[PDB]
Amino acid sequence: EDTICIGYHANNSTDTVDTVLEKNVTVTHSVNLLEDSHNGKLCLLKGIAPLQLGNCSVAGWILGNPECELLISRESWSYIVEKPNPENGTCYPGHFADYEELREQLSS
Amino acid sequence: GLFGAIAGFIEGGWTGMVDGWYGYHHQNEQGSGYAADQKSTQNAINGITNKVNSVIEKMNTQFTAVGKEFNKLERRMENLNKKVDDGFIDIWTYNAELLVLLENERTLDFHDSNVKNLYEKVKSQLKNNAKEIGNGCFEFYHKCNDECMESVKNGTYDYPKYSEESKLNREKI
Amino acid sequence: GLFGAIAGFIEGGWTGMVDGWYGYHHQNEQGSGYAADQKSTQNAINGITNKVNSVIEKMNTQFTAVGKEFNKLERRMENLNKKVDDGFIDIWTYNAELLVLLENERTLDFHDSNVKNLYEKVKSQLKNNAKEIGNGCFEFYHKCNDECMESVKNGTYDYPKYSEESKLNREKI
Amino acid sequence: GLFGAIAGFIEGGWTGMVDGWYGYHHQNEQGSGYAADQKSTQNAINGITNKVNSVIEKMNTQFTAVGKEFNKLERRMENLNKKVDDGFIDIWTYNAELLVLLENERTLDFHDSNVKNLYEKVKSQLKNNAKEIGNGCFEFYHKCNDECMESVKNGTYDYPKYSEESKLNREKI
Amino acid sequence: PMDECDAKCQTPQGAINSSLPFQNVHPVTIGECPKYVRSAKLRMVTGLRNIPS
Numbered sequence: 001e002d003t004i005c006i007g008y009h010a011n012n013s014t015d016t017v018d019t020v021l022e023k024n025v026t027v028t029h030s031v032n033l034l035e036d037s038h039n040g041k042l043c044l045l046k047g048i049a050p051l052q053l054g055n056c057s058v059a060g061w062i063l064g065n066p067e068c069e070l071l072i073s074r075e076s077w078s079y080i081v082e083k084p085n086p087e088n089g090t091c092y093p094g095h096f097a098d099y100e101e102l103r104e105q106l107s108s
Numbered sequence: 109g110l111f112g113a114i115a116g117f118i119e120g121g122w123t124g125m126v127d128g129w130y131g132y133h134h135q136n137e138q139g140s141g142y143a144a145d146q147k148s149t150q151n152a153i154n155g156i157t158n159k160v161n162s163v164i165e166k167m168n169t170q171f172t173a174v175g176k177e178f179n180k181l182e183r184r185m186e187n188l189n190k191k192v193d194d195g196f197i198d199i200w201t202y203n204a205e206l207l208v209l210l211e212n213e214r215t216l217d218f219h220d221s222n223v224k225n226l227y228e229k230v231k232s233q234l235k236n237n238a239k240e241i242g243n244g245c246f247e248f249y250h251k252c253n254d255e256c257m258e259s260v261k262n263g264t265y266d267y268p269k270y271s272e273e274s275k276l277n278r279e280k281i
Numbered sequence: 282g283l284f285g286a287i288a289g290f291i292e293g294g295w296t297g298m299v300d301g302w303y304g305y306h307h308q309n310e311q312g313s314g315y316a317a318d319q320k321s322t323q324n325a326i327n328g329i330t331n332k333v334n335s336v337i338e339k340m341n342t343q344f345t346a347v348g349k350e351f352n353k354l355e356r357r358m359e360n361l362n363k364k365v366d367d368g369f370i371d372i373w374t375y376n377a378e379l380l381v382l383l384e385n386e387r388t389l390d391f392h393d394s395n396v397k398n399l400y401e402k403v404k405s406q407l408k409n410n411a412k413e414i415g416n417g418c419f420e421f422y423h424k425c426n427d428e429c430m431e432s433v434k435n436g437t438y439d440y441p442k443y444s445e446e447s448k449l450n451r452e453k454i
Numbered sequence: 455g456l457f458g459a460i461a462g463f464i465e466g467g468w469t470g471m472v473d474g475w476y477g478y479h480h481q482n483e484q485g486s487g488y489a490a491d492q493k494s495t496q497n498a499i500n501g502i503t504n505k506v507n508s509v510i511e512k513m514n515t516q517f518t519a520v521g522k523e524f525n526k527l528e529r530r531m532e533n534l535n536k537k538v539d540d541g542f543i544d545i546w547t548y549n550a551e552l553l554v555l556l557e558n559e560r561t562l563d564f565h566d567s568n569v570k571n572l573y574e575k576v577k578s579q580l581k582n583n584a585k586e587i588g589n590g591c592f593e594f595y596h597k598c599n600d601e602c603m604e605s606v607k608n609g610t611y612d613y614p615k616y617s618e619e620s621k622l623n624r625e626k627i
Numbered sequence: 628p629m630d631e632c633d634a635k636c637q638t639p640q641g642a643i644n645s646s647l648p649f650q651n652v653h654p655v656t657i658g659e660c661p662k663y664v665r666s667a668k669l670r671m672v673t674g675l676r677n678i679p680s
């Protein structure tokens with residue numbers, strides 16, 4: 001005869017979520033909470049651009065090593081960018097004292 | 109599951125119901141069709157929305173430079189920093205994963221809730237004017253045109269209007 | 282809510298009932314009145330009490346001086362300290378707020394539980410000697426003076442003592 | 455408890471049933487006996503197992519030397535280290551204990567779930583061919599030899615095969 | 628490579644979208660960053676158990 005049924009939504013989604021009691025539970029809707037992608041670019045932070053040193057370490061840049069872009073134009077920055085092994089640092093050998101501190105304080 | 113409706117007596121879902129999460133399937137002569145109950149579906153969307161926006165929007169994060177660089181006579185400091193970083197990473201990893209697990213279980217149980225409560229809502233309207241056929245389905249004793257169905261959907265059903273015919277058709281069964 | 286009793290089929294609450302959280306309203310000739318079911322109410326007070334006293338009393342805190350003062354060649358140390366403080370504050374803020382949310386939901390669901398279970402307790406005692414009128418209410422077929430009501434309240438009801446009169450009054454309905 | 459089956463209408467447990475967590479007791483002439491429903495029991499073992507293995511297996515811990523030793527002009531550093539250690543210990547103690555509490559409650563509620571859902575599974579098969587005697591027990595109107603019982607256990611019951619006899623035995627009751 | 632994009636979280640390999648609470652890209656960051664975790668998958672269900680047929 002006549003009928004009224006009560007049921008629930010379903011679709012083609014294959015999203016799986018882990019659960020306390022059961023794992024790989026296929027669900028209709030889901031949301032990611034875990035960022036796992038980077039844009040492979042050194043963007044600028046909160047409106048301020050980083051300081052580019054190109055080929056020099058902080059020591060070379062601030063001492064005025066003859067081969068470093070002194071970047072007189074730069075009046076503010078958010079963070080500093082070196083390379084793994086900068087090429088032009090203390091061109092006349094010697095020890096730079098309290099170097100980690102200075103790097104820390106010139107960071108921004 | 110935890111309430112025995114989803115994956116319980118209601119064996120599966122309706123791929124044909126796109127109007128929302130919770131709904132109805134009727135079978136009056138005039139024809140069939142699927143509908144959604146926008147009250148319960150909407151309350152569920154608001155609740156789940158608030159949950160997710162509560163796991164996300166609650167993360168305050170100051171401006172922070174995680175990195176610290178030390179020399180060769182500052183190994184104690186370097187290992188202390190390392191100890192801080194690694195400690196926080198352990199905490200957030202553990203609490204984050206268990207949070208996701210527990211609240212996923214909670215969400216599924218919450219949907220199961222809404223469906224069972226809906227089934228009971230319909231049942232409390234049809235006490236003797238219908239029987240519990242199969243699962244998530246009632247068979248009427250009186251014929252219920254579209255008007256009557258849409259009446260069950262919006263809560264108003266009008267029982268004594270159909271009580272007599274039902275009283276007849278039920279006796280021989 | 283999650284069980285469909287509070288804000289569900291029971292539309293609202295009884296401002297006149299001060300004896301506790303859960304209770305009864307009877308309507309025998311002798312007169313009306315509100316009462317509370319001290320068993321379930323007391324179990325709920327013990328449970329909730331234990332919850333709150335478990336969110337508070339579980340906070341061990343050693344004697345600690347959060348402040349550290351550094352000079353101008355200790356910026357690495359100063360930022361490390363800052364990093365520790367800010368990290369803990371982030372953790373405790375997040376976990377505290379989500380804890381309050383989740384357990385508030387759990388508490389409301391717990392009350393909804395207690396009320397539904399109470400309704401069912403009454404229903405399983407009155408199977409055919411009464412009908413489910415309206416919501417959170419039963420109408421008797423046999424008249425039930427104060428003594429009988431107070432019997433339903435303390436669990437003992439004595440069904441076959443009233444089964445015959447009920448069998449009569451029910452037929453014509 | 456939260457669903458009113460364990461410590462609810464089912465007053466206690468069956469010390470004689472060793473086949474599992476959930477099961478049956480039948481009383482057909484041929485004789486009595488206890489059995490377990492391995493479907494629900496096994497699903498519960500898988501779920502709980504996954505829970506515990508989720509609270510344990512989720513603890514990543516790097517190789518770490520907690521101890522740091524300082525001299526007499528490094529009290530700021532020593533109190534900083536002390537502050538880190540003490541902070542983490544506070545966090546893990548609090549979160550660990552509340553986790554155990556909350557998840558114990560959740561587990562007990564989960565068992566209560568499984569039992570109530572099982573009771574309802576049996577009820578939905580025997581609508582008019584039986585009555586709800588006592589608690590966690592049904593009395594048949596037609597006599598149900600071992601084969602029939604083992605039918606209720608594996609889901610298949612075959613109702614219209616026994617509907618007539620029941621229709622007879624029920625009228626005078 | 629350096630670029631004109633703007634972000635609120637920076638990490639050696641490249642900037643991050645800082646709207647979600649957790650990440651797994653790189654531990655050592657600079658900015659208003661998500662928290663680093665040793666997790667492959669942190670996915671929360673908003674819908675219900677999908678059982679088509």
Ligand SMILES: *[C@@H]1O[C@H](CO)[C@@H](O[C@@H]2O[C@H](CO)[C@@H](O[C@@H]3O[C@H](CO)[C@@H](O)[C@H](O)[C@@H]3O)[C@H](O)[C@H]2NC(C)=O)[C@H](O)[C@H]1NC(C)=O
Pocket residue numbers: 065066067087088089090091
């Ligand atoms: C900035 O960095 C560049 C790259 O390192 C420096 O130029 C390089 O200087 C080294 C000496 O330390 C040169 O290596 C030597 O070359 C001679 C032959 O010229 C060879 O016989 C030695 O055995 C040794 O390998 C290297 O060729 C040279 N590279 C270039 C491209 O010039 C430069 O001196 C640095 N600038 C400052 C201011 O420090």
Ligand SMILES: *[C@@H]1O[C@H](CO)[C@@H](O[C@@H]2O[C@H](CO)[C@@H](O)[C@H](O)[C@H]2NC(C)=O)[C@H](O)[C@H]1NC(C)=O
Pocket residue numbers: 054055087
């Ligand atoms: C940084 O220094 C490197 C040197 O290692 C420069 O690389 C040279 O670039 C020129 C032309 O750009 C090439 O002809 C050379 O062969 C490169 N040298 C090597 C060793 O590969 C690089 O150009 C410098 N970058 C800046 C911005 O000054």
Ligand SMILES: *[C@@H]1O[C@H](CO)[C@@H](O[C@@H]2O[C@H](CO)[C@@H](O)[C@H](O)[C@H]2NC(C)=O)[C@H](O)[C@H]1NC(C)=O
Pocket residue numbers: 644645646647
């Ligand atoms: C940064 O992350 C947020 C959240 O992960 C992204 O917002 C999502 O956008 C997609 C498509 O517009 C939606 O399907 C999601 O539901 C959104 N999530 C939330 C939480 O609102 C945002 O698009 C990301 N930004 C960039 C530039 O990638």
